[PDB]
Design a protein around this nucleic acid. Structure first.
Length: 51
RNA sequence: ACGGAAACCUUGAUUCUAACGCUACUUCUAAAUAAGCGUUA
């Protein structure tokens, strides 16, 4: 989206939301990702950032 | 020492019976708690 002070993403490129008088066209409402069953704290470590 | 005197337009009566402010309607739609590590030493 170049119509602005600095560029940003075009959120309307993949259509989402309801439209007035138009058929519902949300693709990523059809993809529904559930979360995980909780795992244990025995699987956790204390890593550090290296660049 | 009057066409005059005496005489309640009065008694008893429920503006009452029956009737759902009800029927239908997702607070809904997309969205990684994530990005940047320069320069000096």
């Amino acid at each position: 989206n170049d119509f602005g002070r600095f560029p940003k993403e075009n959120k309307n490129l993949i259509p989402w939301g309801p439209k007035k008088g138009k058929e519902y066209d949300d693709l990523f409402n059809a993809i529904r990702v559930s979360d995980s069953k909780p795992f244990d704290n025995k699987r956790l470590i204390l890593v550090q950032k290296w660049d």
